[PDB]
Amino acid sequence: ASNFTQFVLVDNGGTGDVTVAPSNFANGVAEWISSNSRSQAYKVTCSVRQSSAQNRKYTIKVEVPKVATQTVGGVELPVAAWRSYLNMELTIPIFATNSDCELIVKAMQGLLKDGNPIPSAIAANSGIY
Amino acid sequence: ASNFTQFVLVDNGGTGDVTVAPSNFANGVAEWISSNSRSQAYKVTCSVRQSSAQNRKYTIKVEVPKVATQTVGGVELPVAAWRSYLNMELTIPIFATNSDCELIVKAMQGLLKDGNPIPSAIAANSGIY
Amino acid sequence: ASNFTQFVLVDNGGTGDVTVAPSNFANGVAEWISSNSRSQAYKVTCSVRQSSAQNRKYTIKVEVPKVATQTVGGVELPVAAWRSYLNMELTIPIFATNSDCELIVKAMQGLLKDGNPIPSAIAANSGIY
Amino acid sequence: ASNFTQFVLVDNGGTGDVTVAPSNFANGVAEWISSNSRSQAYKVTCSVRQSSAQNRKYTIKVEVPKVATQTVGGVELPVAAWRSYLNMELTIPIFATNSDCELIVKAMQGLLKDGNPIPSAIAANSGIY
Amino acid sequence: ASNFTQFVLVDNGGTGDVTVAPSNFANGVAEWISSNSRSQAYKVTCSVRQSSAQNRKYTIKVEVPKVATQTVGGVELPVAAWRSYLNMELTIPIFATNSDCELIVKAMQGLLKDGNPIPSAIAANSGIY
Amino acid sequence: ASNFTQFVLVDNGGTGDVTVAPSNFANGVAEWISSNSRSQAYKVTCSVRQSSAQNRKYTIKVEVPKVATQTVGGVELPVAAWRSYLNMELTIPIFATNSDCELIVKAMQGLLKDGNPIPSAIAANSGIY
RNA sequence: UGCGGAUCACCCA
RNA sequence: UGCGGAUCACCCA
RNA sequence: UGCGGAUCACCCA
RNA sequence: UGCGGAUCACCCA
């Protein structure tokens, strides 16, 4: 085993699926990027740290690019029109058991499930009301 | 088309499900809490704002209780030993269309799907290896 | 020929054995933990480095939980009253061959074998007399 | 009884076994050395100390020599090409019972058992991977 | 998945092969060492970094030792009579796709294929003529 | 005899092959360029020198271009969108025989063989992990 | 306290 | 610590 | 940045 | 000497 495996970041039913693969582990930061030039790649980074005597903190980062082709100095280059950045920090007490942590994962999955308040608002460019 | 309604945060397949219901809306910050004491409740807050000229930023906070050896309705100190904190900040450039935002949501769902690296590590009290 | 695999740390003869499994690899420091909450888990970390021009140094750390009167999955404070810490540092001159290193390992196994002075004293809450 | 007895440090099946014997107890440090000149001897030292109000700390040291014969000033002397040094510190809480301490000993024996990750890496001059 | 694994550095048929194994990955620098005496070992290190806004730079190092036995005063140690030092730096713009990178690799493998100008000169203590 | 000849730098089956040819050998620096527009050409240079009393040092350079067409004001020129820069230095003591040099070459060819750690990382825009 | 160092019951921060 | 900011493993209070 | 040096992740202009 | 930078046989400490 090694959980540092590749996974499907954006699922579009097998056709046009954004897949992300292990690309770096330097400095304790696990990194994943899609098969693109470094300038147009989806990027995911993860790191864990004992943030205190009784706490552990996960720091996760996701970068979603809007791929474009730009003409700089009369030449064509693969670039990113802009990027969207997700930054999350999860602080878990050292007292949390394996079942306690599964409860945290389930909460995050239910938070972002299709049809629920938050993903509905984000997908429509609105707030909660 | 109001989206501030109750939803299932922790789905255990109908039996043992955790439901979170609207509980506050002070200052545009929508809040949802489970039916517990606030020291043991599941909490979710969400707010959107124009962080700058080029971006909008969603701030989602989630609080999850440590359930193992928990005494329902009891006083458990210190507070930090019994709660986990999730802090999410999504930055979306003002040029993102509904389609772009939908993709960004799929990426978040993909990052947390069962079997993937990040959720598997969190659930096993691990990092990447 | 990968050696970062799970192993039996505490052998009780098949029944009641404690298994430690790979859990982290941030910064070359390999980590193994038992299936518990991190406050009650068995932990093992290991790293090697060129401490100086003439030597290499292995740093092995082991954390063992106090099990008597322990409440599985519970919050036990203070942390120092419930854990034992083992700190090992092995310095091997760069001239040591595989044979030399094997002898050094046998010496460590010999020092801790059942019936010998050091382990017998540790197990009886004693010193030398 | 008196656990200050001689033991077999390096076991080679009865032939070429490095045996170590009680040689000193001055200043609370128990010492053992093999039957060699003090310059080529295997050395083991052990001491216990109440390192705090609620902690006890064992300090163990093992020295494995690479015996050689050197010619200084035209004369032959028994000496050590180089030495390997093992330094360990075990901190145990005063609350650990006799059964709790046996668990610590078992962990150290299982840590160094033939075929496991750590002794495998050390014996082959590599790291964990 | 992991690429910080053991690999054959020098291929001499089936036996006589020099194999290098992971030894350390501290501060973004991956290190590989061959077995036995560190003093006579082959060394391979690798690191990547963002050298500028548009460039990522690989820094690869290889050390080939000339195995020998030193003798001073009658004491003999395994050493390296001398070492050959390979030092390479590879700069690749961030607009390079996985296809462009594969070509850069083919170029490196071709520059050193048996029979070509450069490896021939090196193999014969020669230069170009 | 001469080793300042034409050779295949990038091998793509039988056709698509990049061939580099001698172009200049001024001041102890041998240079090889691929055919057509110098602006989109592959470049390879090589030089040797006595860097110190006991060492001779090779300095090899390779340039991989990203063929493109520039357009400014309507005039179009063949250019290189960008270039990948390989820079290597190989130091070899004067005591190295033709046999020792052949090993150094095998080590270089092995470091870059398909499948091994380093060429794989480079080919996938990755680092070590 | 140090996954700081050593010629190893000493030295350093 | 911030429901502070970013060009996103960095910056600010 | 050096077709600058090394005992090779350091040092020099 | 740099796991220092480059538009790459140059430039920096």
JSON list of N, CA and C (backbone and C1' of nucleotides) in Angstrom, two decimals, chain I residues 1-6 8-13, chain J residues 1-6 8-13:
[
{"chain": "I", "resi": 1, "resn": "U", "atom": "O5'", "xyz": [22.01, 32.08, -15.90]},
{"chain": "I", "resi": 1, "resn": "U", "atom": "C5'", "xyz": [22.29, 32.71, -17.15]},
{"chain": "I", "resi": 1, "resn": "U", "atom": "C4'", "xyz": [23.66, 33.36, -17.25]},
{"chain": "I", "resi": 1, "resn": "U", "atom": "C3'", "xyz": [24.87, 32.43, -17.24]},
{"chain": "I", "resi": 1, "resn": "U", "atom": "O3'", "xyz": [25.09, 31.85, -18.55]},
{"chain": "I", "resi": 1, "resn": "U", "atom": "C1'", "xyz": [25.27, 34.27, -15.79]},
{"chain": "I", "resi": 2, "resn": "G", "atom": "P", "xyz": [25.79, 30.39, -18.70]},
{"chain": "I", "resi": 2, "resn": "G", "atom": "O5'", "xyz": [27.35, 30.71, -18.86]},
{"chain": "I", "resi": 2, "resn": "G", "atom": "C5'", "xyz": [28.04, 31.52, -17.90]},
{"chain": "I", "resi": 2, "resn": "G", "atom": "C4'", "xyz": [29.54, 31.43, -18.07]},
{"chain": "I", "resi": 2, "resn": "G", "atom": "C3'", "xyz": [30.13, 30.04, -17.87]},
{"chain": "I", "resi": 2, "resn": "G", "atom": "O3'", "xyz": [30.22, 29.34, -19.11]},
{"chain": "I", "resi": 2, "resn": "G", "atom": "C1'", "xyz": [31.08, 31.50, -16.29]},
{"chain": "I", "resi": 3, "resn": "C", "atom": "P", "xyz": [29.88, 27.76, -19.18]},
{"chain": "I", "resi": 3, "resn": "C", "atom": "O5'", "xyz": [31.13, 27.07, -18.48]},
{"chain": "I", "resi": 3, "resn": "C", "atom": "C5'", "xyz": [32.44, 27.61, -18.65]},
{"chain": "I", "resi": 3, "resn": "C", "atom": "C4'", "xyz": [33.23, 26.80, -19.65]},
{"chain": "I", "resi": 3, "resn": "C", "atom": "C3'", "xyz": [34.17, 27.62, -20.51]},
{"chain": "I", "resi": 3, "resn": "C", "atom": "O3'", "xyz": [35.40, 27.87, -19.83]},
{"chain": "I", "resi": 3, "resn": "C", "atom": "C1'", "xyz": [33.00, 26.02, -21.84]},
{"chain": "I", "resi": 4, "resn": "G", "atom": "P", "xyz": [35.61, 29.26, -19.03]},
{"chain": "I", "resi": 4, "resn": "G", "atom": "O5'", "xyz": [34.76, 29.09, -17.68]},
{"chain": "I", "resi": 4, "resn": "G", "atom": "C5'", "xyz": [35.02, 28.02, -16.78]},
{"chain": "I", "resi": 4, "resn": "G", "atom": "C4'", "xyz": [35.75, 28.53, -15.56]},
{"chain": "I", "resi": 4, "resn": "G", "atom": "C3'", "xyz": [36.04, 27.49, -14.49]},
{"chain": "I", "resi": 4, "resn": "G", "atom": "O3'", "xyz": [37.19, 26.72, -14.80]},
{"chain": "I", "resi": 4, "resn": "G", "atom": "C1'", "xyz": [35.14, 29.41, -13.47]},
{"chain": "I", "resi": 5, "resn": "G", "atom": "P", "xyz": [37.19, 25.14, -14.51]},
{"chain": "I", "resi": 5, "resn": "G", "atom": "O5'", "xyz": [37.55, 25.02, -12.96]},
{"chain": "I", "resi": 5, "resn": "G", "atom": "C5'", "xyz": [38.90, 25.11, -12.52]},
{"chain": "I", "resi": 5, "resn": "G", "atom": "C4'", "xyz": [38.96, 24.95, -11.02]},
{"chain": "I", "resi": 5, "resn": "G", "atom": "C3'", "xyz": [38.35, 23.67, -10.45]},
{"chain": "I", "resi": 5, "resn": "G", "atom": "O3'", "xyz": [39.20, 22.53, -10.56]},
{"chain": "I", "resi": 5, "resn": "G", "atom": "C1'", "xyz": [37.56, 25.49, -9.21]},
{"chain": "I", "resi": 6, "resn": "A", "atom": "P", "xyz": [38.57, 21.05, -10.43]},
{"chain": "I", "resi": 6, "resn": "A", "atom": "O5'", "xyz": [38.18, 20.94, -8.89]},
{"chain": "I", "resi": 6, "resn": "A", "atom": "C5'", "xyz": [39.17, 21.10, -7.88]},
{"chain": "I", "resi": 6, "resn": "A", "atom": "C4'", "xyz": [38.54, 20.94, -6.52]},
{"chain": "I", "resi": 6, "resn": "A", "atom": "C3'", "xyz": [37.79, 19.63, -6.35]},
{"chain": "I", "resi": 6, "resn": "A", "atom": "O3'", "xyz": [38.68, 18.59, -5.95]},
{"chain": "I", "resi": 6, "resn": "A", "atom": "C1'", "xyz": [36.39, 21.40, -5.71]},
{"chain": "I", "resi": 8, "resn": "C", "atom": "P", "xyz": [33.77, 14.87, -1.31]},
{"chain": "I", "resi": 8, "resn": "C", "atom": "O5'", "xyz": [33.01, 16.01, -2.13]},
{"chain": "I", "resi": 8, "resn": "C", "atom": "C5'", "xyz": [32.36, 17.09, -1.45]},
{"chain": "I", "resi": 8, "resn": "C", "atom": "C4'", "xyz": [31.25, 17.67, -2.31]},
{"chain": "I", "resi": 8, "resn": "C", "atom": "C3'", "xyz": [30.19, 16.71, -2.83]},
{"chain": "I", "resi": 8, "resn": "C", "atom": "O3'", "xyz": [28.94, 17.41, -2.91]},
{"chain": "I", "resi": 8, "resn": "C", "atom": "C1'", "xyz": [31.23, 17.76, -4.65]},
{"chain": "I", "resi": 9, "resn": "A", "atom": "P", "xyz": [27.78, 17.12, -1.83]},
{"chain": "I", "resi": 9, "resn": "A", "atom": "O5'", "xyz": [26.78, 18.35, -2.02]},
{"chain": "I", "resi": 9, "resn": "A", "atom": "C5'", "xyz": [27.24, 19.70, -2.02]},
{"chain": "I", "resi": 9, "resn": "A", "atom": "C4'", "xyz": [26.08, 20.65, -1.86]},
{"chain": "I", "resi": 9, "resn": "A", "atom": "C3'", "xyz": [25.24, 20.43, -0.61]},
{"chain": "I", "resi": 9, "resn": "A", "atom": "O3'", "xyz": [24.67, 21.66, -0.18]},
{"chain": "I", "resi": 9, "resn": "A", "atom": "C1'", "xyz": [23.91, 20.01, -2.52]},
{"chain": "I", "resi": 10, "resn": "C", "atom": "P", "xyz": [25.10, 22.30, 1.23]},
{"chain": "I", "resi": 10, "resn": "C", "atom": "O5'", "xyz": [26.63, 22.69, 1.01]},
{"chain": "I", "resi": 10, "resn": "C", "atom": "C5'", "xyz": [27.00, 23.98, 0.54]},
{"chain": "I", "resi": 10, "resn": "C", "atom": "C4'", "xyz": [28.50, 24.07, 0.41]},
{"chain": "I", "resi": 10, "resn": "C", "atom": "C3'", "xyz": [29.05, 25.40, -0.07]},
{"chain": "I", "resi": 10, "resn": "C", "atom": "O3'", "xyz": [29.17, 26.36, 0.98]},
{"chain": "I", "resi": 10, "resn": "C", "atom": "C1'", "xyz": [30.06, 23.66, -1.30]},
{"chain": "I", "resi": 11, "resn": "C", "atom": "P", "xyz": [29.14, 27.93, 0.63]},
{"chain": "I", "resi": 11, "resn": "C", "atom": "O5'", "xyz": [30.52, 28.18, -0.13]},
{"chain": "I", "resi": 11, "resn": "C", "atom": "C5'", "xyz": [31.76, 28.20, 0.59]},
{"chain": "I", "resi": 11, "resn": "C", "atom": "C4'", "xyz": [32.92, 28.34, -0.37]},
{"chain": "I", "resi": 11, "resn": "C", "atom": "C3'", "xyz": [32.90, 29.55, -1.30]},
{"chain": "I", "resi": 11, "resn": "C", "atom": "O3'", "xyz": [33.33, 30.76, -0.69]},
{"chain": "I", "resi": 11, "resn": "C", "atom": "C1'", "xyz": [33.37, 27.63, -2.56]},
{"chain": "I", "resi": 12, "resn": "C", "atom": "P", "xyz": [32.87, 32.18, -1.32]},
{"chain": "I", "resi": 12, "resn": "C", "atom": "O5'", "xyz": [33.66, 32.28, -2.71]},
{"chain": "I", "resi": 12, "resn": "C", "atom": "C5'", "xyz": [35.09, 32.35, -2.74]},
{"chain": "I", "resi": 12, "resn": "C", "atom": "C4'", "xyz": [35.59, 32.60, -4.16]},
{"chain": "I", "resi": 12, "resn": "C", "atom": "C3'", "xyz": [35.00, 33.80, -4.88]},
{"chain": "I", "resi": 12, "resn": "C", "atom": "O3'", "xyz": [35.64, 35.03, -4.52]},
{"chain": "I", "resi": 12, "resn": "C", "atom": "C1'", "xyz": [34.98, 31.95, -6.33]},
{"chain": "I", "resi": 13, "resn": "A", "atom": "P", "xyz": [34.91, 36.43, -4.86]},
{"chain": "I", "resi": 13, "resn": "A", "atom": "O5'", "xyz": [34.98, 36.52, -6.46]},
{"chain": "I", "resi": 13, "resn": "A", "atom": "C5'", "xyz": [36.18, 36.91, -7.13]},
{"chain": "I", "resi": 13, "resn": "A", "atom": "C4'", "xyz": [35.89, 37.22, -8.58]},
{"chain": "I", "resi": 13, "resn": "A", "atom": "C3'", "xyz": [34.80, 38.27, -8.78]},
{"chain": "I", "resi": 13, "resn": "A", "atom": "O3'", "xyz": [35.27, 39.62, -8.66]},
{"chain": "I", "resi": 13, "resn": "A", "atom": "C1'", "xyz": [34.28, 36.36, -10.06]},
{"chain": "J", "resi": 1, "resn": "U", "atom": "O5'", "xyz": [34.41, 23.21, -6.85]},
{"chain": "J", "resi": 1, "resn": "U", "atom": "C5'", "xyz": [34.17, 22.69, -5.53]},
{"chain": "J", "resi": 1, "resn": "U", "atom": "C4'", "xyz": [33.32, 23.57, -4.64]},
{"chain": "J", "resi": 1, "resn": "U", "atom": "C3'", "xyz": [31.85, 23.75, -5.04]},
{"chain": "J", "resi": 1, "resn": "U", "atom": "O3'", "xyz": [31.06, 22.62, -4.62]},
{"chain": "J", "resi": 1, "resn": "U", "atom": "C1'", "xyz": [32.78, 25.85, -4.44]},
{"chain": "J", "resi": 2, "resn": "G", "atom": "P", "xyz": [29.73, 22.20, -5.45]},
{"chain": "J", "resi": 2, "resn": "G", "atom": "O5'", "xyz": [28.53, 22.97, -4.71]},
{"chain": "J", "resi": 2, "resn": "G", "atom": "C5'", "xyz": [28.60, 24.39, -4.52]},
{"chain": "J", "resi": 2, "resn": "G", "atom": "C4'", "xyz": [27.25, 24.95, -4.10]},
{"chain": "J", "resi": 2, "resn": "G", "atom": "C3'", "xyz": [26.13, 24.77, -5.12]},
{"chain": "J", "resi": 2, "resn": "G", "atom": "O3'", "xyz": [25.40, 23.57, -4.87]},
{"chain": "J", "resi": 2, "resn": "G", "atom": "C1'", "xyz": [26.45, 27.07, -4.75]},
{"chain": "J", "resi": 3, "resn": "C", "atom": "P", "xyz": [24.90, 22.65, -6.09]},
{"chain": "J", "resi": 3, "resn": "C", "atom": "O5'", "xyz": [23.69, 23.47, -6.73]},
{"chain": "J", "resi": 3, "resn": "C", "atom": "C5'", "xyz": [22.82, 24.22, -5.88]},
{"chain": "J", "resi": 3, "resn": "C", "atom": "C4'", "xyz": [21.52, 23.49, -5.69]},
{"chain": "J", "resi": 3, "resn": "C", "atom": "C3'", "xyz": [20.91, 23.67, -4.30]},
{"chain": "J", "resi": 3, "resn": "C", "atom": "O3'", "xyz": [20.18, 24.89, -4.22]},
{"chain": "J", "resi": 3, "resn": "C", "atom": "C1'", "xyz": [20.77, 21.39, -4.99]},
{"chain": "J", "resi": 4, "resn": "G", "atom": "P", "xyz": [20.87, 26.22, -3.62]},
{"chain": "J", "resi": 4, "resn": "G", "atom": "O5'", "xyz": [21.84, 26.74, -4.78]},
{"chain": "J", "resi": 4, "resn": "G", "atom": "C5'", "xyz": [21.33, 27.06, -6.07]},
{"chain": "J", "resi": 4, "resn": "G", "atom": "C4'", "xyz": [21.28, 28.56, -6.25]},
{"chain": "J", "resi": 4, "resn": "G", "atom": "C3'", "xyz": [20.81, 29.04, -7.61]},
{"chain": "J", "resi": 4, "resn": "G", "atom": "O3'", "xyz": [19.39, 29.03, -7.70]},
{"chain": "J", "resi": 4, "resn": "G", "atom": "C1'", "xyz": [22.75, 30.23, -7.01]},
{"chain": "J", "resi": 5, "resn": "G", "atom": "P", "xyz": [18.69, 28.54, -9.07]},
{"chain": "J", "resi": 5, "resn": "G", "atom": "O5'", "xyz": [18.72, 29.82, -10.01]},
{"chain": "J", "resi": 5, "resn": "G", "atom": "C5'", "xyz": [17.75, 30.85, -9.88]},
{"chain": "J", "resi": 5, "resn": "G", "atom": "C4'", "xyz": [18.00, 31.93, -10.90]},
{"chain": "J", "resi": 5, "resn": "G", "atom": "C3'", "xyz": [18.03, 31.49, -12.35]},
{"chain": "J", "resi": 5, "resn": "G", "atom": "O3'", "xyz": [16.74, 31.32, -12.93]},
{"chain": "J", "resi": 5, "resn": "G", "atom": "C1'", "xyz": [19.89, 32.86, -11.95]},
{"chain": "J", "resi": 6, "resn": "A", "atom": "P", "xyz": [16.58, 30.44, -14.28]},
{"chain": "J", "resi": 6, "resn": "A", "atom": "O5'", "xyz": [17.24, 31.36, -15.40]},
{"chain": "J", "resi": 6, "resn": "A", "atom": "C5'", "xyz": [16.74, 32.67, -15.65]},
{"chain": "J", "resi": 6, "resn": "A", "atom": "C4'", "xyz": [17.54, 33.31, -16.76]},
{"chain": "J", "resi": 6, "resn": "A", "atom": "C3'", "xyz": [17.56, 32.49, -18.04]},
{"chain": "J", "resi": 6, "resn": "A", "atom": "O3'", "xyz": [16.42, 32.76, -18.83]},
{"chain": "J", "resi": 6, "resn": "A", "atom": "C1'", "xyz": [19.77, 33.08, -17.45]},
{"chain": "J", "resi": 8, "resn": "C", "atom": "P", "xyz": [19.89, 32.19, -25.70]},
{"chain": "J", "resi": 8, "resn": "C", "atom": "O5'", "xyz": [20.87, 31.72, -24.53]},
{"chain": "J", "resi": 8, "resn": "C", "atom": "C5'", "xyz": [22.11, 32.39, -24.30]},
{"chain": "J", "resi": 8, "resn": "C", "atom": "C4'", "xyz": [23.11, 31.47, -23.62]},
{"chain": "J", "resi": 8, "resn": "C", "atom": "C3'", "xyz": [23.39, 30.13, -24.30]},
{"chain": "J", "resi": 8, "resn": "C", "atom": "O3'", "xyz": [24.75, 29.78, -24.04]},
{"chain": "J", "resi": 8, "resn": "C", "atom": "C1'", "xyz": [22.57, 29.74, -22.13]},
{"chain": "J", "resi": 9, "resn": "A", "atom": "P", "xyz": [25.86, 29.90, -25.20]},
{"chain": "J", "resi": 9, "resn": "A", "atom": "O5'", "xyz": [27.25, 29.81, -24.42]},
{"chain": "J", "resi": 9, "resn": "A", "atom": "C5'", "xyz": [27.52, 30.64, -23.29]},
{"chain": "J", "resi": 9, "resn": "A", "atom": "C4'", "xyz": [29.00, 30.62, -22.97]},
{"chain": "J", "resi": 9, "resn": "A", "atom": "C3'", "xyz": [29.91, 31.05, -24.11]},
{"chain": "J", "resi": 9, "resn": "A", "atom": "O3'", "xyz": [31.09, 31.64, -23.59]},
{"chain": "J", "resi": 9, "resn": "A", "atom": "C1'", "xyz": [30.33, 28.79, -23.59]},
{"chain": "J", "resi": 10, "resn": "C", "atom": "P", "xyz": [31.39, 33.20, -23.86]},
{"chain": "J", "resi": 10, "resn": "C", "atom": "O5'", "xyz": [30.25, 33.95, -23.05]},
{"chain": "J", "resi": 10, "resn": "C", "atom": "C5'", "xyz": [30.45, 34.36, -21.70]},
{"chain": "J", "resi": 10, "resn": "C", "atom": "C4'", "xyz": [29.20, 35.03, -21.17]},
{"chain": "J", "resi": 10, "resn": "C", "atom": "C3'", "xyz": [29.27, 35.53, -19.74]},
{"chain": "J", "resi": 10, "resn": "C", "atom": "O3'", "xyz": [29.91, 36.81, -19.64]},
{"chain": "J", "resi": 10, "resn": "C", "atom": "C1'", "xyz": [27.28, 34.33, -20.04]},
{"chain": "J", "resi": 11, "resn": "C", "atom": "P", "xyz": [30.60, 37.23, -18.25]},
{"chain": "J", "resi": 11, "resn": "C", "atom": "O5'", "xyz": [29.38, 37.45, -17.25]},
{"chain": "J", "resi": 11, "resn": "C", "atom": "C5'", "xyz": [28.54, 38.60, -17.36]},
{"chain": "J", "resi": 11, "resn": "C", "atom": "C4'", "xyz": [27.39, 38.51, -16.38]},
{"chain": "J", "resi": 11, "resn": "C", "atom": "C3'", "xyz": [27.76, 38.34, -14.91]},
{"chain": "J", "resi": 11, "resn": "C", "atom": "O3'", "xyz": [28.15, 39.55, -14.26]},
{"chain": "J", "resi": 11, "resn": "C", "atom": "C1'", "xyz": [26.11, 36.76, -15.46]},
{"chain": "J", "resi": 12, "resn": "C", "atom": "P", "xyz": [29.06, 39.48, -12.92]},
{"chain": "J", "resi": 12, "resn": "C", "atom": "O5'", "xyz": [28.10, 38.87, -11.80]},
{"chain": "J", "resi": 12, "resn": "C", "atom": "C5'", "xyz": [26.92, 39.57, -11.37]},
{"chain": "J", "resi": 12, "resn": "C", "atom": "C4'", "xyz": [26.27, 38.86, -10.20]},
{"chain": "J", "resi": 12, "resn": "C", "atom": "C3'", "xyz": [27.17, 38.58, -9.00]},
{"chain": "J", "resi": 12, "resn": "C", "atom": "O3'", "xyz": [27.33, 39.70, -8.14]},
{"chain": "J", "resi": 12, "resn": "C", "atom": "C1'", "xyz": [25.92, 36.64, -9.51]},
{"chain": "J", "resi": 13, "resn": "A", "atom": "P", "xyz": [28.53, 39.71, -7.06]},
{"chain": "J", "resi": 13, "resn": "A", "atom": "O5'", "xyz": [28.11, 38.60, -6.00]},
{"chain": "J", "resi": 13, "resn": "A", "atom": "C5'", "xyz": [27.12, 38.85, -4.99]},
{"chain": "J", "resi": 13, "resn": "A", "atom": "C4'", "xyz": [27.16, 37.76, -3.95]},
{"chain": "J", "resi": 13, "resn": "A", "atom": "C3'", "xyz": [28.53, 37.54, -3.31]},
{"chain": "J", "resi": 13, "resn": "A", "atom": "O3'", "xyz": [28.82, 38.46, -2.25]},
{"chain": "J", "resi": 13, "resn": "A", "atom": "C1'", "xyz": [27.71, 35.47, -4.10]}
]
